[PDB]
Amino acid sequence: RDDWRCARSMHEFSAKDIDGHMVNLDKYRGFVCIVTNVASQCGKTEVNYTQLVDLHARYAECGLRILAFPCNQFGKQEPGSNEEIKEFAAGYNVKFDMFSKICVNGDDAHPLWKWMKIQPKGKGILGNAIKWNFTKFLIDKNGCVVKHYGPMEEPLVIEKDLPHYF
Ligand SMILES: *CC(=O)N(c1ccc(OC)c(Cl)c1)[C@H](C(=O)NCCc1ccccc1)c1cccs1
């Protein structure tokens, strides 16, 4: 639709988790979140999953949460079913939140992703297009986008930004 344009927080959105159940993202109010588009057959799948698991293990007790959205739009590198992707993520000992596969670009992009991309200046992205697998957004406790990190930036580079938002 168009109402996503008017939102001011991630917490105004909902999304289906990887089991198919709708999740209201306002449950993340009060938590610092990394939101990322993931893929199982990407050249950087291992480094992204393992470092995201490591960050979550290290900072969940501080309030860090991670929202992973599978997306097949980049080299068709997430071709499997939601059940297969859940089983894949389990292989990296993922304990953060897996969502159902979505689009992140184009007219059928999930509204949360349409919204994140238009956030200002250094928060949202340039060109209204996610470029590849494993773009990361840092979301503060109020659900606002505070930083983004591109497909080639390892998740551990986010660690230096976390203390300003916990
Ligand atoms: C979990 C947590 O939030 N930590 C922390 C506090 C404040 C900030 O920045 C505002 C950040 Cl990034 C993290 C832990 C932490 O507090 N570790 C110390 C453990 C402890 C031991 C005894 C009593 C109380 C706390 C941090 C993780 C890395 C650096 S600080």
Side-chain angles (χ1 to χ4, degrees):
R1 203 169 169 74
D2 243 19
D3 290 80
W4 61 268
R5 299 182 180 279
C6 312
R8 291 176 183 181
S9 174
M10 177 179 85
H11 307 152
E12 297 185 57
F13 295 92
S14 293
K16 285 201 299 177
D17 72 17
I18 201 159
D19 300 317
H21 301 133
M22 194 64 61
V23 176
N24 192 326
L25 302 186
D26 64 6
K27 76 174 189 174
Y28 295 105
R29 184 180 292 114
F31 299 94
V32 173
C33 303
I34 297 166
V35 179
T36 185
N37 59 302
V38 300
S40 300
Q41 301 176 19
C42 171
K44 294 185 171 54
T45 287
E46 179 142 294
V47 66
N48 273 274
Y49 265 102
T50 59
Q51 289 190 5
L52 288 168
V53 169
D54 175 60
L55 284 169
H56 191 223
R58 230 124 45 69
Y59 294 108
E61 60 203 359
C62 312
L64 182 71
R65 301 295 185 266
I66 300 177
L67 292 73
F69 288 86
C71 178
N72 196 33
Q73 288 184 293
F74 305 108
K76 291 176 176 174
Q77 294 180 348
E78 190 73 301
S81 70
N82 286 322
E83 312 84 63
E84 291 172 327
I85 296 161
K86 184 185 181 188
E87 182 160 278
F88 181 84
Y92 287 116
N93 303 323
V94 167
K95 299 180 175 52
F96 54 78
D97 300 320
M98 299 292 300
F99 288 81
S100 280
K101 189 195 302 184
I102 60 165
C103 287
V104 303
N105 291 329
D107 312 294
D108 295 324
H110 189 286
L112 171 68
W113 280 78
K114 295 185 178 191
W115 174 84
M116 289 190 298
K117 289 188 296 183
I118 69 162
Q119 293 316 288
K121 288 84 256 297
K123 331 298 216 311
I125 63 109
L126 220 177
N128 200 41
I130 304 303
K131 298 309 180 297
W132 203 243
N133 307 295
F134 295 108
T135 304
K136 300 85 162 174
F137 291 93
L138 185 61
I139 309 300
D140 72 15
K141 292 186 291 188
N142 295 317
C144 307
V145 180
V146 290
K147 208 89 48 179
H148 72 268
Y149 312 80
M152 293 171 326
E153 302 188 69
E154 298 188 343
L156 285 182
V157 87
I158 306 170
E159 189 168 2
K160 88 226 232 304
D161 293 317
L162 296 179
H164 299 272
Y165 302 105
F166 282 144

